[PDB]
Amino acid sequence: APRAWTPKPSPMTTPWTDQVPVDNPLPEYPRPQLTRPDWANLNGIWDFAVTSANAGQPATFPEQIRVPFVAESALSGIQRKITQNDKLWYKRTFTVPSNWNGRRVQLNFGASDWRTTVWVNGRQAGAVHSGGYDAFSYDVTDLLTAGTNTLVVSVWDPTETGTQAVGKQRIRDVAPHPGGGILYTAASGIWQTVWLEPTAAAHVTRLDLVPDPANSRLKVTVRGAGISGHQARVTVSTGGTTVGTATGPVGTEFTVPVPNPRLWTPEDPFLYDVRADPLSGGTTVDSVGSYTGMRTIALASVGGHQRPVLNGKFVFQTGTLDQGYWPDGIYTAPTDAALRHDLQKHKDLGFNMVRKHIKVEPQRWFYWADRLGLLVWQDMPNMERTPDAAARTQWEAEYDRIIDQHRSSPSLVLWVNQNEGWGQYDQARLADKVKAYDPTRLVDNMSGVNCCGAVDGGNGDVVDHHVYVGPGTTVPSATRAAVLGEFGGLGFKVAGHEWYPGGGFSYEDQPDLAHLNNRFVGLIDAIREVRMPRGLSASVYTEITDVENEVNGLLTYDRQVVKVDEARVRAANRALIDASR
């Protein structure tokens, strides 16, 4: 028997640290934009081991871990530093619901950092998966028994010693300490829900729902496994009202009417239900639920300046930098309420945008931005240094998968390919590649071309400066809108709510909360009165929460304290948005 699972005191307590279930944490459906009623959540207490990197499966698993929290986190019950010379081993038993008899069974991982190998009942389930930010799945039907099944997963993660996408993760001793700067605790292992679902053999794996409200229609591509010879019926509805339906070919775009569309905006994030049914004749072979928000994003020349236009109209995108870090969970928010809290706070403070910083969150995060009405800018997580040929192939493969996994999100409107030159290469080529791969989103070739040795490819849709404290003097070009991809960074150490007392740093330390509030609102007023009329179209305020010793959140790292006067910040942001309109 392994050492029984043991909770670990968290470095800071969030409102939800003590709210995490033991046996079924993160219970919510993990893929809310492609749904079926039948599923089973495999989160909870697994047996666990740490071996050397090249070890095979251990004969004994001596410990237990709480999936899906990384080994570095307190919530995992392990809370240990994991190096490139280590490998994580997970094992649990599971039963298949008997009502799934006669269906295929898919085993789904939302994410696992970095290189994951999976065995079901001793048999490798499929190819090793490399990449810490993209979901992956195996068809495990043929490997199952009617009895107790065993699932074993190995996960190797070299963090920054590897050539792979890592973002802010660095190999760090886990106990709070000073002097880590803007890089934080690493995240190794399974960090998003693991689950099972039954499917017909021929089944939908992906929906690409592309709003075309100007043409009162939804562009749909139904994709999947074994269905390429079929038609598909796609229906758009709201409540009990059918809005439109069409039958078209699987794997090729076709349109479904959406007459008199109600548009998705941050102010009114209206969502329509969507159902997709691959058909043989009139026989439904599979059926998935989904949704869409009817919105477009593009560039246009407005009042003499290139501007990003939402549904054909310019609105200023006033956002925060959001790094997705948790003191208790590291990469994984302790509960769904915790995950969405950070986005709710954006809304409370009058922001209409979020830049998710060199991290891709789970699908439920995109669902929350979709529902709450925030524009999303998505960074591709960077590599730690210049890639060699294999590293480039791998990074591009990851990015392709991340793009393909988010095509239907209304919130997502912009891709940030690279950040401040980190691991930079092929700046112009990657901008064109991403735009061609997802032309209904904006593309940012490089964030912070004004600084840091970052090379501007010269293309993509935006010229993106990082200016601290800011807001600087970025102006659009004839071809590109001007954005402030980072600014602000105002620090304040809140006693009782410091990850490491006295450890905090920022781009400008404030002596008290009155100073922080005045200085913050002065930045937003500057943008409203001077920079936006001169061509600035978006700004990203660093940052939504403190992270480790970077104490420039609007919120403390534990989410316990809102440092700013919410009514004042909301009023400044709303004034900016209103003025832009």
Residue 177: C-alpha distances to residues 84, 181, 187, 543, 548 (Å): 21, 11, 17, 21, 9
Identify what 420 binds: Mg ion, ligand A1L3Z, none; CB under 5 to 8 Å per kind. Answer: ligand A1L3Z
Reference 152, options 161, 142, 141, 140; nearest CA is 140
- Is 71 a residue that touches Mg ion (CB under 5 A)? no
Residue 157 binds which one of Mg ion, ligand A1L3Z, none, with CB within 5 to 8 A depending on kind?
A: Mg ion
Q: Is 169 annotated as a binding residue?
A: yes
Sheet containing 194-199: give its strands across: 40-41, 194-199, 104-109, 136-139
Closer residue to Mg ion, CB minimum distance, 157 or 322: 157
Hey, which residues between 3 and 42 contact ligand A1L3Z (CB under 6 A)? none
HEC secondary structure over 314-349: ECCEEEEEECCCECCCECCCCCHHHHHHHHHHHHHC
Q: Is 394 annotated as a binding residue?
A: no
* Residue 210 in the binding site for Mg ion (CB under 5 A): no
User: Residue with the closest Cβ to Mg ion?
Assistant: 113
Smallest distance from the beta carbon of 163 to ligand A1L3Z, in angstroms? 20
Contact partner, 113, from ligand A1L3Z, Mg ion, none, Cβ < 5-8 Å per class: Mg ion
Task: List binders of ligand A1L3Z among 416-475 (CB under 6 A).
Answer: 419-420
Size of interface with Mg ion, in residues (CB under 5 A):
5
DSSP for 483-519, written as a single string = EEEEEE-EE---TT--SSTT--B-SEE-SSHHHHHHH
C-alpha to C-alpha distances, 395 to 387, 430, 467, 476, 578, nearest whole angstrom: 9, 11, 28, 30, 40
CA dist list (Å): 389 to 79, 157, 164, 192, 403 = 35, 20, 12, 29, 21
Q: Shortest distance, CB of residue 314 to ligand A1L3Z, whole angstroms?
A: 26
Residues in contact with Mg ion, shown as a per-residue x/- string from 135 to 174 under the rule CB under 5 A: ----------------------x-----------x-----
3-state secondary structure of 300: strand
Q: Which of residues 87-126 bind Mg ion (CB under 5 A)?
A: 113
For position 383 contacting Mg ion by CB under 5 A, the verdict is: no
The answer to whether the annotation marks 84 as part of a ligand binding site is no
Told to check if 549 binds ligand A1L3Z by CB under 6 A, we report: no
What is the smallest separation between the CB atom of 479 and Mg ion, expressed in angstroms? 37
Nearer residue to ligand A1L3Z within complex by CB, 26 or 544: 544
Residue 187 binding Mg ion, by CB under 5 A: yes
Using CB under 6 A as the binding criterion, the count of chain residues that bind ligand A1L3Z stands at 8
What does the alpha-carbon distance between residue 514 and residue 106 come to, in Å, rounded to a whole number?
54
486 interacts with ligand A1L3Z by CB under 6 A: yes
- How would you list the strands of the sheet with 203-212, edge to edge? 203-212, 217-225, 254-257
Given the rule CB under 6 A, which residues bind ligand A1L3Z? Answer: 182, 419-420, 486, 489, 542-543, 550
List residues forming the annotated binding site: 113, 157, 169, 187
Given the rule CB under 5 A, which residues bind Mg ion? Answer: 113, 157, 169, 187-188
